[PDB]
A and B are shown apart, each in its own frame.
Chain A
Amino acid sequence: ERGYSFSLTTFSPSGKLVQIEYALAAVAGGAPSVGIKAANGVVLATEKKQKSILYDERSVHKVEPITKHIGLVYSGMGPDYRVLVHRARKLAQQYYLVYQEPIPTAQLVQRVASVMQEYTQSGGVRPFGVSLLICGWNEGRPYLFQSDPSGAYFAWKATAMGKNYVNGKTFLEKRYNEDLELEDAIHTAILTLKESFEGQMTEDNIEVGICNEAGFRRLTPTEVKDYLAAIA
């Protein structure tokens, strides 16, 4: 537009990236979420409270598929979320055009991490305020990855981001464990999302997606209401 193109993200006198720290604080101001890998597939749980009774929960979805076997949720701000959602949507399809093969999630988080780290340095932008959880079932062992505004990427067994992630972190330190089943991950995931919720949790509050090894399937409020019935 002008060619100003100077990076407003600079180093501190201590040596700390300041905008990445503040962006991680903006991650900490976001909605809580937790995701657990257990021995056949990966269950992602998010926590969506509409600010009024006027609202519609049928419109906006948080668990958003990327392929027919790859899901992706966040903990941060939605308007910065959907951009790299769409960037991952276009980005997987060049892999499906070149190699003619379902893209591995390991390759996704490499490339999306390259986009985000490459975006922290470019001409005059703030970084994204989004911390992603990316799941999927490739080659027989289901994966769960987490990215962040620093462009880094981790490989967690069962983590949690958003509000009270040290509370859900210590809760997922002991209560999460060696190996479960697909339904057994849902129980402890709804419990650890029931760590920091309000006085009621319905089919409109939570929204839970899974990855089978045979393929992705986002769940419906019928079973989302049936499992949390059965408080966790």
Chain B
Amino acid sequence: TGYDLSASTFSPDGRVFQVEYAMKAVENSSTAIGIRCKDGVVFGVEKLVLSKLYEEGSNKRLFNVDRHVGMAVAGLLADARSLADIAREEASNFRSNFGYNIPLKHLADRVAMYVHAYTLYSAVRPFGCSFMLGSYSVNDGAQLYMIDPSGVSYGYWGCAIGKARQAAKTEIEKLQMKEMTCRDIVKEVAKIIYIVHDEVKDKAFELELSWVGELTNGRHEIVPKDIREEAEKYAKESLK
């Protein structure tokens, strides 16, 4: 006892338990994945509807930090909105100061040093949020970064965050990043977001998809989920 309470105390085996408890706090939240193609970044978040709870489009875990950068948060939600406001403000500082649009590398550093900066004191608690960062610029290419509650930021071609995490990142190695256009990769996400999280746990669900890349011309926005409706047209035909 006594080694798990505060964040600033090492445990005798040599790890920090508040950080380890922060890692598996995101483990209870629902699955949200991401993947990049050769010219764009595709997001997808499965969202939970039990009976009535909310109007369609409530508390969307897809955010929009800059003109060309977006979030895909999973875990506890309020601190994820706090990181959305802080990363928003950091893109405002870089945009105001140095005159050009923020690269995804500096944004990953300046956010990840804050997420780390709340794991050094017993003033605060470590965050309980993990989020994706997708972007595209013609002098940059599509990058996809992944920030955990511990503060580690690095780069995937594809990732997954949630309960069904390993099962939802098992199948991504079947897909090919290098050749595919992202317009395929939309339904190529929605097929396994429909496949993972089988409906015995929760009766119903609802899907969000957000898509930035070359076709949207740098601007990040949600795809019109009604428009082309490619998800469930493949997904009801993907059970057999």
Contacts and interface: CB of A to CB of B under 8 A. Distances in A.
Interface residues on A, range: under 10
A2 interface: yes
A178 interface: no
Interface in A1-38: 1-2
Interface in B111-133: 121, 123
A2 B8 CA distance: 14
B118 to A, nearest CB: 13
Contacts of B123: 1-2
A125 to B, nearest CB: 15
Interface in B88-123: 121, 123
A1 B8 CA distance: 14
A2 B123 CA distance: 7
Contacts of A2: 121, 123
A14 B197 CA distance: 65
Nearest to B121: A1
A124 to B, nearest CB: 12
A2 B121 CA distance: 9
B9 to A, nearest CB: 15
A3 to B, nearest CB: 10
A44 B83 CA distance: 57
A1 B123 CA distance: 8
Contacts of A1: 121, 123
A41 B144 CA distance: 68
A82 to B, nearest CB: 23
Nearest to B120: A1
A1 B124 CA distance: 11
Interface string A208-231: 000000000000000000000000
Interface in B184-212: none
Nearest to A2: B123
A1 B121 CA distance: 9
Nearest to B123: A2
Contacts of B121: 1-2
A91 to B, nearest CB: 30
A172 B121 CA distance: 48
A140 B122 CA distance: 54
Interface in B150-190: none
Nearest to B122: A2
Interface string A132-169: 00000000000000000000000000000000000000
A4 to B, nearest CB: 9
B104 to A, nearest CB: 32
B198 to A, nearest CB: 47
A77 B123 CA distance: 29
A2 B120 CA distance: 13
B123 to A, nearest CB: 5
B204 to A, nearest CB: 46
Interface string A96-131: 000000000000000000000000000000000000
B179 to A, nearest CB: 51
B187 to A, nearest CB: 51
B120 to A, nearest CB: 10
A12 to B, nearest CB: 23
Interface string A74-106: 000000000000000000000000000000000
B1 to A, nearest CB: 21
A189 B121 CA distance: 47
A100 to B, nearest CB: 44
B156 to A, nearest CB: 35
A119 to B, nearest CB: 21
Across the A-B interface, give the 4 residue pairs with the lowest CB-CB distance, nearest first.
A2-B123, A1-B121, A1-B123, A2-B121
4 contacts: A1-B121, A1-B123, A2-B121, A2-B123
